[PDB]
Amino acid sequence: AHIAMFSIAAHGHVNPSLEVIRELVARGHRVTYAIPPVFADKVAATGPRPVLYHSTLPGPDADPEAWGSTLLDNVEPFLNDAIQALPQLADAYADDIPDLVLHDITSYPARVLARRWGVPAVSLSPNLVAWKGYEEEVAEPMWREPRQTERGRAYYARFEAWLKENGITEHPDTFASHPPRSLVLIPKALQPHADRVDEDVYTFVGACQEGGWQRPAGAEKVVLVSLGSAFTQPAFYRECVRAFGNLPGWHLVLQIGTPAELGELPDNVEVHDWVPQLAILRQADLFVTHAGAGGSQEGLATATPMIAVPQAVDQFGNADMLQGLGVARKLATEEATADLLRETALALVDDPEVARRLRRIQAEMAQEGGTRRAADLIEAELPA
Numbered sequence: 422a423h424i425a426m427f428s429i430a431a432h433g434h435v436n437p438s439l440e441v442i443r444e445l446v447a448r449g450h451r452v453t454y455a456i457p458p459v460f461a462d463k464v465a466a467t468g469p470r471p472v473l474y475h476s477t478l479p480g481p482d483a484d485p486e487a488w489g490s491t492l493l494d495n496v497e498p499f500l501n502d503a504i505q506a507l508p509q510l511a512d513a514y515a516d517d518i519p520d521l522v523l524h525d526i527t528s529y530p531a532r533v534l535a536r537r538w539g540v541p542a543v544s545l546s547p548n549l550v551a552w553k554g555y556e557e558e559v560a561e562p563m564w565r566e567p568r569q570t571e572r573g574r575a576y577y578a579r580f581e582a583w584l585k586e587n588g589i590t591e592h593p594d595t596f597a598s599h600p601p602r603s604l605v606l607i608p609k610a611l612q613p614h615a616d617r618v619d620e621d622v623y624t625f626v627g628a629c630q631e632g633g634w635q636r637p638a639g640a641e642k643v644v645l646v647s648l649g650s651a652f653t654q655p656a657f658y659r660e661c662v663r664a665f666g667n668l669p670g671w672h673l674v675l676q677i678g679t680p681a682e683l684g685e686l687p688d689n690v691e692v693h694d695w696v697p698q699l700a701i702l703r704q705a706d707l708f709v710t711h712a713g714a715g716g717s718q719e720g721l722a723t724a725t726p727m728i729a730v731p732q733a734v735d736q737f738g739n740a741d742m743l744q745g746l747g748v749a750r751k752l753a754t755e756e757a758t759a760d761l762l763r764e765t766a767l768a769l770v771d772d773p774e775v776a777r778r779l780r781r782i783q784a785e786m787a788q789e790g791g792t793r794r795a796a797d798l799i800e801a802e803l804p805a
């Protein structure tokens with residue numbers, strides 16, 4: 422089959438499904454990938470053929486602030502990009518209409534084209550999705566006042582008119598936030614209101630994902646501290662060193678992203694600017710994490726209890742959810758002192774119920790199935 426994938430040039434909207442694209446190619450499908458030129462090479466590595474289009478969105482290396490800091494500044498760019506991208510893509514595919522459209526959540530043109538072409542669309546979400554009641558519980562209150570401003574009224578009017586020009590009568594919110602079919606590339610454990618998500622629309626597949634690491638001989642408890650790749654806090658690192666430094670039985674791996682700023686280190690502490698995080702987590706008993714999407718899923722994937730110390734807006738939810746699962750404790754940076762970190766660590770690693778819960782979450786993530794399940798489910802949507 423000819424499967425056409427669509428995304429934007431943003432790491433967090435391309436990296437999550439690259440392996441799925443690779444696997445569909447490996448299985449013998451003809452895969453094309455609508456992508457801005459900066460990500461042509463990234464995409465091509467999968468065996469998919471890049472179909473280039475010009476984007477008006479910030480580049481993949483832009484600061485997070487380039488994407489806006491208000492509701493309308495966040496959403497407007499996706500409509501404006503879509504208005505100018507759609508004709509380029511309609512033109513590109515005109516003589517080679519795909520059998521199935523795959524797309525990241527950010528690509529409105531993919532939605533329009535799938536409908537225009539009369540072919541199935543599968544939305545690939547790298548984050549949480551709407552549950553039943555989301556419209557009344559989250560969307561309506563969030564939009565209530567902005568929608569009534571001249572700017573918000575104009576935005577929705579424009580969006581509706583664009584959809585109507587293209588033969589689409591669905592309300593913009595339905596079109597944007599409510600896909601007919603979706604695969605979700607996070608564990609359902611990190612989905613708010615998971616029991617209320619429509620399983621007829623959404624299927625959770627989890628993350629679709631170097632070097633090794635060896636535990637020091639005789640270490641009873643290994644703790645990894647890693648605040649991810651961006652939001653990486655010297656005072657907190659100092660508290661970590663003080664928490665686990667010279668603590669009998671414990672070995673601390675500290676991922677800092679200067680080692681001098683940390684002071685002289687105890688003998689049971691190893692410091693690195695970068696670590697093979699997954700490799701360490703497979704060999705770790707505790708994970709002190711900022712609760713980013715990757716770290717949170719890897720902690721669960723590896724059944725590693727967590728101290729969640731969220732840094733940025735995108736992490737507080739994950740931290741709350743991890744603690745709610747009974748497999749983590751959330752601390753405010755921040756109050757994350759040596760004494761509290763140590764007590765928290767000791768409580769988590771010794772708790773058999775925490776370990777039971779992690780094992781069950783691992784079992785549940787096994788059922789989600791990742792890359793090869795996502796590929797199986799996509800194939801299942803191919804027309805007869």
Ligand SMILES: CC[C@H]1OC(=O)[C@H](C)[C@@H](O[C@H]2C[C@@](C)(OC)[C@@H](O)[C@H](C)O2)[C@H](C)[C@@H](O[C@@H]2O[C@H](C)C[C@H](N(C)C)[C@H]2O)[C@](C)(O)C[C@@H](C)C(=O)[C@H](C)[C@@H](O)[C@]1(C)O
Nearest residue numbers: 431488495496499526527548549550551597598599734735
């Ligand atoms: C429920 C279903 C809805 O999903 C969300 O609410 C998730 C949970 C947002 O993240 C939430 C949560 C959070 C923390 O982002 C992960 C926050 O930053 C943003 C504002 O809203 C997403 C993904 C936002 O994207 C993010 O927008 C940022 C401006 C830049 C970021 N990027 C490219 C770097 C990008 O991923 C953004 C604006 O909603 C995407 C546009 C296309 C939408 O309006 C779409 C249609 C959504 O309404 C949705 C898919 O229907």
Ligand SMILES: O=c1ccn([C@@H]2O[C@H](COP(=O)(O)OP(=O)(O)O)[C@@H](O)[C@H]2O)c(=O)[nH]1
Nearest residue numbers: 649650651676695696698699713714715716
């Ligand atoms: O030293 C490091 C730092 C991070 N990572 C990986 O980088 C990703 C970080 O993603 P996350 O969403 O957790 O945090 P972000 O950097 O986006 O805030 C995860 O897959 C980590 O395993 C890694 O392998 N080694």
